[PDB]
């Protein structure tokens, strides 16, 4: 089965994804994945392209076996003391600034429960591994997926962003050839020139006002085939899939598939998705489920949403505690953009895109490329042929 | 690690819990699982206590291994033929009117998806594992998580609905002195009276109108230890977690975590708990965060919120194919209430009790809950002795 | 993915096997779980056919969700109180002579350990389960897993026992043809004439001299096709696969694949199985590799061996303490039989067919037994056009 | 839970080891990685220290999250082409003599099966990760799972060499104070003299008649607690775990615990270890069990066995197919040693330290190494105070 796993520290050596059970023959280069890293730096307003594929990958092919991409930290000769794999002389390191004490967890980061959860009496080893920065890492391992989905199915994933801050909802979805002008060419990823404007304005504002923002992003998968994903159980429901892996995400507080909270409000009456004839199988005419119903992708486009908090700390305005002391603090910030939601819905694509492949492995199995084609060709003539 | 497993059809002979995983020495019975079955049938507006605990409790104490439940098909004489699970004479099946074939999938429901996805002519098979009567035996299984819970930790899951249909949404949690009035006393399972009020007229509206209503449920868990969860990775955090076993429930199509999509739209300045000096530890006043920091407990409340979509087909109003044909058709209702949110609510706390559960077990090991107990009592005090 | 759970205690109210993961379509039959169950009993020298299909099954055909099986315990009326889920007045259980603690673990079996490791002060939680009943659900999900082998690659798992006791182990192996001889037909499920002879002389002296023996057995899986398990970790090995599966038998201390141990005594010119050419593909004239070459299936039959202890304690022979006192004690027995070799090949056939199964879906993916069997054709004739 | 993945091509740029799931605070090292990847290549008769911990280690200390080893090819230069991640233009490709195509596959090696799995018209992407150079990213794993467990349980893990081809088996474990003279100081990591000229007397017979060898190797786990692995599932118990562990490595093809299958020869009466009262707890004076009852650590050595296969292809003896043509040839080897089973006891350790610290983090739960030992403590007072 597709599995993915992410390693490394925000300023440790490097990064690390590792993809395993991918098919071999799916074609995917470090440009493909570099790619997609540049376009996680995107958002209003990398480093750089030396990424390293380690493993699985030979002449631009899968391999079959684990594909590792090693992504370089580009200021490693900062921390290589501070974030040295090996012991370090305790007194060459007591003369360090950089690796004085964090004692001060952030309001709304991993620092104080991680901190209490591995007896850390430093936030360092939580906030180095807890850090957006290890998104990076899922963002090369979803290229892989991505690459897959692309080849097997011709599907598609994007992004677009719907709020930041207290800007005023977009609605109506885009195909993949917009993602050009989403894609920064727009400052806020947006899809909508209106609701942009707006976001816009939101970050202009907060920034102006030394604060920062979250937002709700949405990905969309166009070209799924029927039936990824499985009602036969809760966790092979690919609603559960995806709300895993999107939640998962750093600062994301909220997930929905199509319409969802919304969906709530409404009656059973307008609430789902009617069905028609059409010359080519049954056609909708909305698309409030998302894509998904009974867990399984039902031949409408693959909605995601994300809520994204605030990410970056608002520079002195958290009351936190010092854990040395027990005395009343600020909370310091690590970051110091005000907003990352565009960069988010790239990261959101990224999950969407992973859980997508390994359900259709799950479903059209294969060990090639050509053979999980050909078992989707099967697969898509028995639709067909009814 | 704790591992849950559903079995059964709604109308198949029975359906199963097993429950892997879990500690000897939890205090649970089969009243307590009736118990919990019978609060899944509460809401506006069972069949019977015979359940039976299979495996894996010995005079109601946990044994350590995998504790199976089968919860009873009360009807089973009326489906012993159709739902048989061996061959019957099809020719004394084309008699069988019940045995007609479902052809018109429901829009909403696993039908059309789940029917292409494995090839069947006939729905039965897809909705009967499909069904929300699967969510039965999930609470059967959560109720030795509660047991646990509440035992090993001294947490207690509970649920509120905060809204309904177009209601007003309700805002500020319940503890578990209100579940009683919560439960139903109220037909809404209501924390606030206004909201239930406002709730109970949507309800009446939809009767009246022939239609069908979703809400949005909150499912708190009290008294949890910091440190539940993990940053390491996105699977490993609390809120993927909570999110792939809330979302996985049927009918579910929104998870958040405390404010969730609201969260999205604050400023960092306002979006986050700040933390203070306690005689105790850290205290905050909000818990915006929902009781999550870094995919970890941080000692605030947890709340997990859900939307869910109408679930019951509303009766002549949604068009669906006849998939034999190809022909426009109205979608047939396999259920005839109006609203299920409440219940809904305990499902919620049922996915939530089993995460939370696992994941307890994940940093506090054990094989007993005394070891366990000691385990927690040991990681209590090096939390306090800081 | 193929997943198969085992819940229940030897003297518990009923065995649960849940199966996962299945195809829909696959034909089987509460009949053929008894089948199987029945030859789970053959052996020198059941209790009964209701056994019962909880879910997962229609008129004997595979649903696509989770089959529950159910095996009912016997002497349930005899267990009731002792084995009780529920509380029981500890004053009517003081009573009970069959309740008396069981503080004397047996040599060989999971007491001690169990014991410790779970805090328990009697070893009837730990027997309960550790026991090899338990094989019996093991049986009844194997039997499923048969039911596709055959269906969906006309692959037959049969074993056949190669020594008991110190008798002179056999060489040569049987075709599914063989089984109905193999099976008791033959006392001790022996394939060859001689061996059998040495093996029930084995038998009658280990009774005559009270003691209890173990043997070695081999299962045997004819007609996999080529690529089923993957080189590309240890863990997706066929090999390390079937070792999990085999070694966690009960009383299993050994396994190898065809000729094992004895292959490590080999040269490499003799130890392994060269190729020539065929009308109808590569041939092999040897087996030495027991059908596994990198960790995957390779076109010749798969053999597995599994080194079996003697299970039944012998009677007054094994010192232990009990563990009440600190005291020096004989271990009683919990079981009389002799020998249990030839029904461990029947388990092991189970457990090869389950990890095949499982493996084989991996590789041919599909939802129904008909995508299944698509994807496997598309695979043999992509073998075969080359 | 601990986890453990392996990716890298032996040709490949660099072998990556990723580590899930381990404590914080677990004192390990880069020297005690590469200590172990020199140890690995011990035997009758590196490269180089720069292996790179990537990830997951601080100062010599884990970290808690991921913790990711790089191991670099050291002749990358000449592969760098041939093994390429990226499309290398085709043409200069078709210069390179070193990437002629490997259409012949080596009997006993993944070569033929992998290529018809996949299919690939060339062996060399099987070849690549299915070679045993994987086993070093698996021993730069198996070191953090050694600190872990020397530092939480003052456990060790040893192997000796018991066999090579026809040598005379040797009987009688070492402890951790022999390790020194087995490791080499032993050209074929023997424990006992006489065993060892023996192997090596086997070893020059082989490289004088051009021929390769197998061999039986045990590795000893001393002072585990009672109670690891579990008897209430078939893959729960330890057995079924280093079994699958141990088998997956590559020419592996037989697992024991303790007496294995001579235990499968003995009668119940000298078939297990009894038990004997003791100042300290209860003793034994045998160890048939290998220090596994029902799947549990039982307080005795862990005794696992393995038998290789000879890996190393014997130069001009075995016959293949060309798979390109059809038509016979003989199999070219690409390794050149006469005898891998020494570093194969190396390997055997790695395998079962990791399965033994993913055990005991089960049991123990922990998230930081204090925490993991407190509960330890508490553990094994609980079993002293009984």
């Known amino acids: 089965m597709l599995r993915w796993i992410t390693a490394g520290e925000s300023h440790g050596r490097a990064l690390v994804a590792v993809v395993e059970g991918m098919v071999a023959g799916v074609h995917v280069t470090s440009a493909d994945i570099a790619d997609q890293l540049a376009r996680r730096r995107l958002g209003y307003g990398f480093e750089r392209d030396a990424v390293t594929v380690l493993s699985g990958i030979r002449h631009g092919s899968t391999l079959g076996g684990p594909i590792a991409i090693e992504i370089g930290n580009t200021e490693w000769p900062k921390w290589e003391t501070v974030m040295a794999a090996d012991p370090v002389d305790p007194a060459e390191l007591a003369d360090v ?42 963002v090369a391992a979803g290229t892989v997926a991505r690459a897959f989905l692309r080849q097997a199915l011709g599907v598609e994933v994007l992004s677009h962003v719907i709020s930041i801050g207290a800007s005023a909802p977009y609605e109506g979805p885009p195909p993949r050839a917009e993602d050009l002008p989403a894609i920064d060419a727009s400052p806020v990823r947006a899809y909508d020139k209106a609701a942009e404007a707006d976001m816009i304005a939101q970050i202009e504002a907060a920034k102006k006002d030394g604060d920062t923002l979250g937002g709700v992003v949405e990905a969309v998968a166009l070209g799924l085939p029927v039936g990824l994903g499985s009602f036969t159980s809760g966790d092979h429901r690919l609603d559960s899939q995806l709300a895993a892996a999107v939640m998962g995400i750093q600062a994301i507080k909220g997930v929905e598939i199509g319409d969802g909270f919304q969906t709530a409000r409404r009656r059973g009456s307008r609430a789902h998705d009617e069905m028609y004839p059409g010359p080519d199988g049954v056609v909708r005419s ?27 700390t ?33 990261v959101v694509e990224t999950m969407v895109a992973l859980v997508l492949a390994r359900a259709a492995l799950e479903k059209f199995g294969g060990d090639s490329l050509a053979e999980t084609q050909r078992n989707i060709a099967a697969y898509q003539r028995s639709v067909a042929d009814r």
């Open 314 to 346: 608002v520079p002195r305005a958290l009351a936190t505690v010092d854990l040395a002391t027990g005395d009343e603090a600020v909370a310091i910030h690590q970051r110091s953009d005000v907003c990352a939601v565009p960069a988010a819905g790239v």
């Open 286 to 312: 909305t698309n409030r489920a998302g894509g998904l119903e009974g867990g399984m992708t039902n031949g409408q486009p693959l909605r995601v949403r994300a809520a994204m908090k605030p990410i970056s």
């Open 97 to 138: 600034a950089r690796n004085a004490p964090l004692t001060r967890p952030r309001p709304g980061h991993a620092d104080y429960a991680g901190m209490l959860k591995y007896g850390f009496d430093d936030a360092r080893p939580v906030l180095e591994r807890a850090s957006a920065r290890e998104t990076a890492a899922r």
